[PDB]
Amino acid sequence: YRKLGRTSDQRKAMLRDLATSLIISERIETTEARAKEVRSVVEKLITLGKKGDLASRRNAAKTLRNVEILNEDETTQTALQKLFGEIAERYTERQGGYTRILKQGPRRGDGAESVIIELV
Amino acid sequence: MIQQETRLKVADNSGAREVLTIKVLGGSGRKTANIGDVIVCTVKNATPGGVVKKGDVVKAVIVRTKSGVRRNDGSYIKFDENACVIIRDDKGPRGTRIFGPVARELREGNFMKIVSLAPEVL
Amino acid sequence: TKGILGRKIGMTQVFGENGELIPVTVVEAKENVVLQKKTVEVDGYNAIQVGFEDKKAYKKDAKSNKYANKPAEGHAKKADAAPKRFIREFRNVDVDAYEVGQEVSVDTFVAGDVIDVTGVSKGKGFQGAIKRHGQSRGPMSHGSHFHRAPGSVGMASDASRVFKGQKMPGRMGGNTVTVQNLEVVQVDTENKVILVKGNVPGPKKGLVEIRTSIK
Amino acid sequence: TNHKLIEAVTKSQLRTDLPSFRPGDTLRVHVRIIEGTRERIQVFEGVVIKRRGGGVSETFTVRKISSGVGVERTFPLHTPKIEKIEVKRRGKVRRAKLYYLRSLRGKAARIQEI
Amino acid sequence: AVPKRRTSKTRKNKRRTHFKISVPGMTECPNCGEYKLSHRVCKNCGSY
RNA sequence: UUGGCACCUCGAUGUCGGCUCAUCGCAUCCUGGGGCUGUAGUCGGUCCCAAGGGUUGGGCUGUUCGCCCAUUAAAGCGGUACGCGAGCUGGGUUCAGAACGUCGUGAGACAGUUCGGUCCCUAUCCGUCGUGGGCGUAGGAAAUUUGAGAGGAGCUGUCCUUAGUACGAGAGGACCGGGAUGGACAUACCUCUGGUGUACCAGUUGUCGUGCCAACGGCAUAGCUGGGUAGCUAUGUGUGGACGGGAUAAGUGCUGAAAGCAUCUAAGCAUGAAGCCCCCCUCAAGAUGAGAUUUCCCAACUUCGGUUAUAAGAUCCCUCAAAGAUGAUGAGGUUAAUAGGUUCGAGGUGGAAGCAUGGUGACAUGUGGAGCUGACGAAUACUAAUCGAUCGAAGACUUAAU
Ligand SMILES: [Mg+2]
C-alpha cells in the first residue's frame, strides 16, 4: 500500500476524509495516487453498507466522518445514512467495482496527475 | 550461545556457584558455545569449602543453555538458565552431585559420568 | 546427464525415514520438450535445447510475451510442440539418448540423485558496502562520523588511483547462481514436482535448471 | 493446479490421529527415543505455550518445570517421533501465546480447568 | 569538492545532449478531432 | 632504524596511535614437498623449493612496542607519504587558562609533569562501483549460444581404524593408507528457530468528541502494553573449497660418454609440491578479430533510387512486480486474470456487536473457534489496462569455386 507522502495517522485521516467526500459528492477531483488508494477504502465502505446489519453500520462508522448532507426539501441526513440507505440500494446487484477513475492531465502548480474518481 | 565474559551458574557441588568464560575451546575465531562445548572460565562466586575456590581458572562443560539446541527431527529444547559443570580434563566431573536437568546431547560428547549423575536427562 | 527446467514454488518440510526434518524446495517441471539437437558437425558442440512452460499461440496484435511471435512459433513448429516461455540447453546430456520433439519427463530423476541447481538470485537493488560486501561498520558512538561508509579506497600518492574491484556500493542480486550437490528427495509424476533438499536461488515462481552434479 | 502443490505434495505426511488442544492445556507427549539399545518411550508433560503456522510446518511448544529449571520443548505437530498426545487437562487462558509464564514461579502460574 | 578547471563549451554541450523533454504521448480524439493525452479525457470535448 | 646532506614543497605537501578498507614483496609463522642430522619412532635441529590460502580474543598503557591471561595449525617480517583524517576518531603531540617540581632578580622558561581545550568542504576531471542511451557488427528481427579473454575460490583442526604391528630395557609410540566429524570463511534461502513487521488482532490510562446509555473516533513516542502475516533478515536452514589430469621447483633417479673407471646430463628417458596450466563457479563477440545455430519477414514505384510506406518485430501510452533511484528488466493491455473490488481460504488474533441469563456491582456465562483481518493461495471482467500513434528491410564491390 502507498504512503502518499504522509505519516500513518495523517494518511489515515486523509483517506477517511476523501472517502467521506466521495460519498457526499458522488465524484471528486484529486491526485492519481490518492484516488488509487481511496478506491479500496470507499469500496469496502459500500461493501459494509450492502450488508446493512447493525454491526456493519457500527463498523462503517469507524471510517466515515460526521458530515451532514442537506437533501432537497430541507431533508437532512448523515454520511452513514447516505451510505446505508441510498448507495447500498444503488449497488445491491453489483458484485464489485463501485468506482471509476478518469485520468486528467497534469495540474499547473505541480505536474501532478489530476483525476476524477466517481461512483459506479 | 555462550561467549566470553558470559556469566554461568554452575550445576554441581564442586564448590563454584558462578563462573565467567575466558575462552570457548575448539578453534581460532570460535566465538560461541552451546551444550556439549567446553570452555575455560574463572570462578566468580564459591561456597565456603569445596575443592574449587574463588579465582581459580578451570575447564567446564556447558549444560542446558537458554539458547537451546535443535535436534535432527526438528525438535528444539531450551532451558531457563545457562549452566555449566566443572570437568577434570578427562571430561569427568569434579563434583559428585550434579543438580538440575541436563540435555541429552551431552551423551554424544562422552560426558557419560555427567549424564548418569544428573536427575533428569532430556 | 538428465537435466530439466522448472519453476520454484516455495519451500516446505518432509519427514524422512527414521523421521528427520528435511527442508525441501518444490520445483514444478511440466511441459518440458526437446526443441533442438545441437551437434558438433553443425554447431561445433553437442547439446539438447529444452523448452519449458507453454506460451499461447501466435495472435495478431499481441502486446506481451504471453503470445509467441512468428520467429518463436516457427522454431517450435519445426519440432512438434507448443511455443515455450523458457528455452535453455544442456551439455551434460548425451544427445543420442534424446530425440527432437520428445518430452523430458519428471521421472528422469530418481530419489537420491545428486544434482546442481542453477537460478537467478533474488534482487536487492542499490545496496551499500556493509550489506553488498559484508564489510564491518564503524563505531556507532564515541564521536564517530563513520557508520556505514566503505573505508579507504586506496593508498596515498603511490597508486594515486583506485584499483579495479574495490568492493564499492551498487546493485545487489539478480545474478546467476549454481548450488552444488543437492539431492532430490522425491518425484511426483502426477503433480510433476521434484522435491529437492534444501533451498535454491531465486524468487518464488522464478526459473530453476536442475542437472546432474558435475562433481 | 499451481497452488495446492505445497499441500498436494505434503498431504501424505499429515497425521490424523492427533487430538485437539489449544494454548493453555497441559498435555503429555509420548516421544520415541532411540538410544543405542531400543526405542523406549519417554513422556514430556507440560503446558502448551504456543503453536504455529499450519501444514506440516506446524509447531507447538510445551513448558514444564523439571527440577526447578524451566524446560521448553517444541515439536513439529506431524513429527512421526510422537507416538501419542494425551490432553491431560483443559485450561482457561485469554492469550494465544503464553510467554508471560516464563517470568512466574509457583502459584503465580496456575490455570483453571475447563 | 570544487572544480579544478573550467568546463569548456564542448564538454558542457556534450553533457547536456540527453537533457531534453519528449513530445507528449498524444492522440487525436475520436469524438472532437483535437489532440488529447492518451488515456486522458479530451479537455476540449470531455469524452472518454 | 638512528643519522648525514639540504635537492621539491613555507602566496600550507595536516606528522602519533586506533578504526574502516585494503594492496604488494618474500628474507616463510602455519599448511604442501625435500636434503643433511650427534634423525631408533613420536619429538626436534638446520638448509633448500614454495607467496595458494590462512595467519585469535582479552588485562595494562594515548600509545606503536612491550609484558601478562587464555587460546591457536599458526598467532610471519616488511613496503605502499613509518598505506589510508576532501573515509572516521582525536587519547598523545604543538596556541591562548591554571597548577606542581625546577631554573631565572624578573618578565618568563623546560620536550619535566598535571587538569581543560572549535577536526571546514554541495565532487569539475582522471580513477573506481553500479546502471542506461547512440552507432557499429553490409538486409531487417526473435531466441539459443561458442568462448578469445577476465574475475572468484584456493585454509585447516580433532577423533576412530590400520595399531599399540613394529620403532620396540623400557617410558613411550607411526609413516602411509582408510573412514567420521568440526573451527574460521564464502554463498544462496525463509521450511524450521528467532528479529522486525507505523493501513493485522487484542488489553489498557488520561482527556476531548460523536447529544445521552451502550458502542466507537481523535490526541498523548505507533499513548502504552501483549501477540503477529507477507516482505526484509541471522544468531536459523542448505551447500562449497571434492576429486582428478598436464608440465614443473627443490629433490630422487635410470641409461650414458666426455675422463675404456666413476658420474642424474652433454645426447636421451623417468619421477617429483597446498605452488603453475586445466579441472570447479561467475562474467564475457565493442573479441571493431565484432563469431555460430534455429526460426520469422520479402514490393512497388522506379525514370533509376540519396525512393516512399510498410512486413517480421519493437515501442509510445496504460494495469503492475518475482524487478527497480531513474532508465532498464520481467508479468499483462479486452481474442485479457495485470492491479483494484467481490467471493472462498491459508496464517494472525483469541472469543465481536446485539441479545439472553446470573450477580447489588465490578463483571461472568451462553449465542459461538465468534468477529475482524496489509502484503500469501484460488475464482470471478464488477472497475481500470476502452481509442490510437510512432519507429522498423528490399539486402555494396572484388576474386575463386560454382
Ligand atoms: Mg598553491
Side-chain angles (χ1 to χ4, degrees), chain A residues 1-16 18-72 75-112 114-117 119-120, chain B, chain C, chain D residues 1-34 36 40-104 106 108-109 111-114, chain E residues 1-30 32-33 35-41 46:
Chain A
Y1 49 80
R2 269 147 176 135
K3 287 177 179 179
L4 301 172
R6 206 166 293 269
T7 71
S8 66
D9 66 79
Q10 301 167 351
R11 175 173 64 235
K12 193 160 100 96
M14 178 207 226
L15 287 177
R16 58 189 287 183
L18 261 165
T20 303
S21 164
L22 183 49
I23 290 204
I24 303 311
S25 288
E26 317 290 343
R27 117 176 204 156
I28 59 181
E29 171 131 46
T30 187
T31 64
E32 176 175 351
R34 290 187 299 217
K36 300 262 202 84
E37 298 290 299
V38 75
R39 158 175 57 167
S40 203
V41 169
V42 68
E43 266 163 36
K44 286 178 199 218
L45 286 192
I46 293 166
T47 283
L48 285 163
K50 280 172 62 168
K51 299 180 182 176
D53 56 314
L54 184 141
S56 177
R57 160 117 63 196
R58 205 72 58 87
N59 269 348
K62 266 162 201 185
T63 298
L64 283 173
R65 300 301 197 180
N66 318 301
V67 180
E68 293 263 356
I69 310 97
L70 254 172
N71 311 97
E72 319 308 326
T75 306
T76 278
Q77 43 111 23
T78 73
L80 208 32
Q81 294 178 237
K82 180 152 184 203
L83 183 65
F84 278 51
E86 154 182 8
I87 294 168
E89 268 140 50
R90 181 178 339 185
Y91 306 123
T92 174
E93 69 313 352
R94 203 196 272 280
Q95 307 293 53
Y98 308 156
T99 47
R100 162 201 278 90
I101 290 198
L102 272 274
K103 289 190 224 269
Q104 297 186 114
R107 54 165 59 161
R108 181 183 179 272
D110 325 302
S114 60
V115 302
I116 301 296
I117 177 161
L119 275 188
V120 56
Chain B
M1 302 201 8
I2 303 300
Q3 39 158 93
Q4 75 170 66
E5 316 287 339
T6 294
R7 292 301 174 102
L8 286 122
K9 144 191 283 302
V10 178
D12 39 57
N13 74 336
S14 70
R17 294 214 281 230
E18 191 187 44
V19 299
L20 114 50
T21 118
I22 289 158
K23 183 90 30 186
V24 286
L25 302 179
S28 153
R30 176 91 167 279
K31 50 208 108 84
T32 47
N34 228 329
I35 296 98
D37 298 6
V38 182
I39 58 172
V40 304
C41 53
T42 176
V43 299
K44 292 295 187 184
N45 217 250
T47 51
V51 308
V52 173
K53 309 262 271 143
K54 174 204 181 23
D56 294 344
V57 178
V58 299
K59 302 285 180 67
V61 61
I62 283 171
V63 308
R64 67 168 184 262
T65 62
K66 103 160 46 163
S67 205
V69 303
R70 184 203 235 246
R71 304 221 155 110
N72 199 175
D73 50 22
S75 159
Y76 300 73
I77 190 170
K78 290 175 175 60
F79 294 85
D80 263 13
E81 29 103 297
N82 299 325
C84 90
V85 160
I86 315 297
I87 49 177
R88 288 185 292 103
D89 202 346
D90 54 297
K91 306 186 298 221
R94 286 183 177 265
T96 49
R97 201 182 291 266
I98 297 208
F99 316 99
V102 159
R104 149 182 336 128
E105 270 83 352
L106 289 176
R107 178 164 290 123
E108 318 160 342
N110 203 146
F111 299 100
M112 242 70 60
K113 197 62 217 293
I114 293 174
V115 168
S116 97
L117 251 199
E120 199 155 14
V121 172
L122 288 138
Chain C
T1 168
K2 55 163 82 154
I4 198 170
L5 296 176
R7 65 199 319 151
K8 170 192 203 166
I9 301 300
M11 292 205 34
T12 359
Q13 59 170 60
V14 308
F15 296 101
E17 163 63 53
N18 182 310
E20 316 102 19
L21 242 194
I22 299 168
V24 306
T25 301
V26 164
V27 176
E28 156 132 348
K30 78 177 180 272
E31 39 249 51
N32 274 82
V33 169
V34 176
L35 273 72
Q36 227 189 325
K37 261 171 109 203
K38 303 297 189 77
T39 277
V40 162
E41 98 100 26
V42 165
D43 302 290
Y45 69 108
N46 321 296
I48 80 182
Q49 208 199 220
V50 177
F52 162 69
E53 278 259 285
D54 248 300
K55 262 206 234 303
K56 312 224 148 97
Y58 167 94
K59 96 201 303 204
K60 260 270 170 32
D61 310 332
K63 302 153 173 153
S64 100
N65 206 37
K66 209 215 277 282
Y67 303 86
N69 45 12
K70 291 247 279 185
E73 157 169 288
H75 175 76
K77 164 189 324 203
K78 181 127 170 251
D80 286 309
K84 302 267 172 323
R85 198 173 281 269
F86 302 96
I87 298 170
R88 294 285 177 281
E89 74 192 19
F90 293 73
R91 303 263 287 278
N92 58 356
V93 303
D94 174 328
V95 294
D96 295 352
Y98 291 95
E99 148 89 0
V100 153
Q102 104 177 32
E103 182 254 342
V104 174
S105 97
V106 185
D107 81 336
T108 182
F109 289 106
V110 46
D113 287 345
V114 185
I115 53 171
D116 280 348
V117 56
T118 296
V120 176
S121 57
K122 288 171 94 176
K124 309 292 173 189
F126 208 123
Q127 294 296 324
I130 105 153
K131 150 167 279 165
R132 180 168 192 225
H133 297 115
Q135 296 188 173
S136 156
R137 80 219 194 287
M140 300 307 301
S141 77
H142 296 276
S144 171
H145 293 71
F146 188 91
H147 289 159
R148 305 181 62 92
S152 320
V153 294
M155 293 75 90
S157 214
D158 249 13
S160 287
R161 72 197 182 105
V162 180
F163 290 158
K164 277 175 171 322
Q166 212 71 74
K167 281 195 331 160
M168 276 185 347
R171 187 168 288 187
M172 213 179 160
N175 309 304
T176 314
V177 182
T178 297
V179 185
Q180 284 187 347
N181 306 323
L182 304 182
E183 70 174 3
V184 309
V185 182
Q186 42 184 102
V187 179
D188 218 336
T189 46
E190 43 283 77
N191 302 122
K192 273 151 227 273
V193 152
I194 312 182
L195 292 199
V196 315
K197 181 180 166 53
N199 37 50
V200 307
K204 268 145 112 191
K205 148 206 316 163
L207 169 85
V208 294
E209 321 178 22
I210 298 171
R211 69 193 78 196
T212 283
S213 273
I214 206 161
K215 289 162 144 190
Chain D
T1 292
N2 271 67
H3 46 118
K4 148 118 172 153
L5 309 141
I6 292 280
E7 335 206 320
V9 162
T10 41
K11 190 158 154 353
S12 64
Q13 41 218 329
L14 262 54
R15 321 185 46 168
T16 31
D17 54 299
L18 293 174
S20 173
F21 62 92
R22 57 180 59 226
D25 317 342
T26 75
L27 45 82
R28 310 162 42 76
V29 177
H30 300 276
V31 187
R32 338 172 312 189
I33 271 60
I34 47 172
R40 74 145 136 90
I41 283 320
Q42 168 195 201
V43 181
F44 193 100
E45 190 217 38
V47 187
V48 178
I49 289 285
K50 76 174 197 173
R51 53 188 288 169
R52 280 197 62 258
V56 261
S57 307
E58 181 134 356
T59 303
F60 71 105
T61 304
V62 287
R63 178 179 163 89
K64 99 175 307 163
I65 309 298
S66 283
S67 311
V69 188
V71 180
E72 277 133 337
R73 189 92 180 279
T74 149
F75 295 101
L77 201 46
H78 305 297
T79 184
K81 285 174 93 49
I82 292 171
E83 192 202 37
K84 155 174 73 133
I85 290 180
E86 326 167 84
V87 167
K88 180 182 110 182
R89 82 187 218 89
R90 201 69 64 184
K92 108 183 308 283
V93 300
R94 300 219 47 211
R95 329 223 74 72
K97 304 191 153 65
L98 299 210
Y99 299 156
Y100 70 84
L101 275 77
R102 290 155 174 178
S103 318
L104 326 185
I111 302 167
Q112 276 179 335
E113 176 168 14
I114 295 145
Chain E
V2 185
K4 194 77 174 177
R5 311 262 325 129
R6 301 159 87 213
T7 303
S8 178
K9 314 205 288 195
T10 302
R11 200 169 281 262
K12 161 173 61 159
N13 288 126
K14 275 176 169 179
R15 191 194 51 242
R16 53 187 61 166
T17 177
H18 291 115
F19 181 70
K20 54 213 300 215
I21 56 196
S22 39
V23 278
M26 79 206 192
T27 284
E28 271 176 14
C29 169
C32 63
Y35 269 109
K36 53 164 258 312
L37 282 189
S38 55
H39 290 80
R40 276 83 183 172
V41 177

